Every structure is written in C-alpha cells, then in structure tokens.
Amino acid sequence: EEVRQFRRLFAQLAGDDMEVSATELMNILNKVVTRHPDLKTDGFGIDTCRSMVAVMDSDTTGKLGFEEFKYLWNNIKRWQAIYKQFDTDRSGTICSSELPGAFEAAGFHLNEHLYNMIIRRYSDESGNMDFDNFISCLVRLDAMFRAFKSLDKDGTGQIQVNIQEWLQLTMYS
Amino acid sequence: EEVRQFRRLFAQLAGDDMEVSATELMNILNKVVTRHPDLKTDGFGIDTCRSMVAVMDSDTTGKLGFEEFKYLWNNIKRWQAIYKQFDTDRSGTICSSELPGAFEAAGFHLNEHLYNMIIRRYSDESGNMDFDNFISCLVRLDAMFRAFKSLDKDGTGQIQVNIQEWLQLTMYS
Ligand SMILES: [Ca+2]
Ligand SMILES: [Ca+2]
Ligand SMILES: [Ca+2]
Ligand SMILES: [Ca+2]
Ligand SMILES: [Ca+2]
Ligand SMILES: [Ca+2]
Ligand SMILES: [Ca+2]
Ligand SMILES: [Ca+2]
Numbered sequence A, B: 001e002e003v004r005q006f007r008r009l010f011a012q013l014a015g016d017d018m019e020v021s022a023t024e025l026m027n028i029l030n031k032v033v034t035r036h037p038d039l040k041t042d043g044f045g046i047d048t049c050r051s052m053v054a055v056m057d058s059d060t061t062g063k064l065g066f067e068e069f070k071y072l073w074n075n076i077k078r079w080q081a082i083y084k085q086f087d088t089d090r091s092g093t094i095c096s097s098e099l100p101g102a103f104e105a106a107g108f109h110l111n112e113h114l115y116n117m118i119i120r121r122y123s124d125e126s127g128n129m130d131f132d133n134f135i136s137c138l139v140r141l142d143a144m145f146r147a148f149k150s151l152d153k154d155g156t157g158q159i160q161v162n163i164q165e166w167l168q169l170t171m172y173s
Helices: A002-017 A022-035 A046-056 A066-088 A099-105 A110-123 A132-150 A163-171 B001-016 B022-035 B046-056 B066-086 B098-106 B112-122 B131-151 B163-170
Strands: A159-162 B158-161
Touching: A002 A022, A002 B022, A002 B163, A022 A046, A022 A132, A022 B022, A022 B112, A046 A066, A046 B046, A046 B112, A046 B163, A066 A099, A099 A132, A110 A132, A110 B163, A132 A159, A132 B163, A159 A163, A163 B112, A163 B131, A163 B163, B001 B022, B001 B066, B022 B046, B022 B131, B046 B066, B046 B131, B066 B098, B066 B131, B098 B112, B112 B131, B131 B158, B158 B163
Parallel strands: none
Antiparallel strands: A159 B158
16 A cells, blocks of 8 residues: 555656656655644755755666655655654754754764764754755765765775766765 | 955955855855846855855864855856856856866866766756856865865875765765
C-alpha cells in the first residue's frame, strides 16, 4: 500500500517528463510546510531547491528520477520528524543548543567546531535555524558524507580528491 | 579619490559592526541591479547571499570585513563588465553559446562535462543564465579553485583530506 501510494505521489509530482524538477520540488515542499504551522520558515526558495536537486542528481539528467527522489523524500520525512522532536521549546526553529541533539538523532555526530561552522553558515543572527535551512543543510551534509565514503575505498579516513572530481562535487551542488 | 569613495561606501554599508552581513550584501546588490536595466534578474535572494558571504568569509567572523568585501566587490565589478561584453545579442542574459567566452575571459577553463553541470545548475530551460545566477556561479567557482590551489601548492592536481577537513571545505549552500 505504501509502495503504491508513493508511486502515485511521484507520478503526479513528476508529470509529463517523469522527473522532478527544482520547481516541482519547491512547490511540493512549500505545500508540506503550509500544513504544519509548527514548522517556521520563510519558504523553500528556488535557489535552495536547485541546489538540492543538483546534489541528489547522481546521473546528471538535471532532474530527479524515481530512485533519486525516493531517497531524498524519505530523508526529508525522517528529518522533519526529528526537527519537531528536537524543537523542545516550540519556537518552530532549531537553536544552537537544540542542533546537536537533532543532528545526532539523524546519525551525524559532529564536533563543536563543525556545529559552530554549521550555525554560522545556516542559522540566523540569533543562532536559530528555520525549517528550509535545516532541510537544505541536512541534504547537503548527507551527500557530503556519502561522497566521502565513496572515495574512501580503503577505509583509512583519508580521501584523495582530484581537481575534476572537486569541481564536479562542489559546483554541481 | 576612488579609494576614499570606496571606503565611504563600505563604511555606510557595513554599519555598526563594521562588517557586511548577507542581508546588507543582498540590499546593495539589489541596488546595483536597479541601476542597470540591461542586466536581467529575478533579484539577489537571501540564500544566495548567505552562500556568497560564507565562501568569502576567510576569517570566520560570519560577515565580510573591509578586505573580504573589497575582494568580492571588485570581482563582481569585473564579472559584470564581462557579462555585458559577452551578451552579444543584448538579451540581458548569457546563453550556453556565450558562456564559454565569458568564463574564459574571467580565466576559467572547464571541460564540456563541467559546463553541462553548470548550465543545469544555473541556467533556465532554454540555456539562458541571468545576472544573479551568473555572479553566484562565478563567486563559487573562483572560491573553489582558490580553496583547492591553496591545498595543492605542488600542482599535483590532487588534495588529501579527512572528514572534518572535507566538511569544512564543502558545507557551503
Ligand atoms: Ca517534471
Ligand atoms: Ca537524475
Ligand atoms: Ca526551538
Ligand atoms: Ca529559511
Ligand atoms: Ca553590518
Ligand atoms: Ca569575515
Ligand atoms: Ca545573451
Ligand atoms: Ca536568478
């Protein structure tokens, strides 16, 4: 039943070219946030959505196919539940003191230095991160751990990255 | 005279913390585009501006100091002139056939594969790129070349990193 329902959701979202564009993704995510008054956001904007699609577009078609979209969408569902669970003051936002528990719950165990860098790059002047910023961050963070793992074939925790690979991974993002 | 005028522009823009925030950068860049009706754009948005500030924030204060802002602003000026020069049909946008000349004029030599990625990430469905997208792309592209070259002083074409280093280098919206 869930497999059939998800297939229908994808079919209706993707439309006539059978892939999910940045605009299509933006529009469905903004529909989600309308339904959840407990998620504070200024909206998912197009630039943020083009970045999400690029970092998830493993076959470089420009758009998200069934499996690419499935991976992203199920992550967003999980991360949404986490954001609500770790917003322990109901601000509708994740503050700097809430952030480590939320990221750790999502399987990302970072250190103070890296949390500080995340807050600086993604959170506002008060140290608060809203829903679109949080989802944009996690999608990227997950992709960057996955890219590292794919290059660390010998399991040493060091990767060698050539210039071409570097430009692909940073620019198509 | 121009040194004095630029110092005044920065002082008035940066205000009471003497650094330029993503919001302050957004506001001045949108003022620029108002003055140049020959540059087509849907505006500089906040997410794009937060990314620009982060990639330019080499002393990790969160905002752009005098020298950081000077380096960014002078790049934007050069790239704006290039955009007008390589828009050889006066559309107010850079098409896929105008892009290589514009990037080459800005010093960047990329393979066909990378251009295809950049056009998918930054250009519209017709292959046309607007002004904010063009500037956002070049600021990132320049930053990513500088980051890599700093870590490959030898010119091996390869860098070695651990996960912390990787995430510091790549966690840029
Ligand atoms: Ca579609
Ligand atoms: Ca794809
Ligand atoms: Ca909260
Ligand atoms: Ca936001
Ligand atoms: Ca300021
Ligand atoms: Ca700074
Ligand atoms: Ca043109
Ligand atoms: Ca634009």
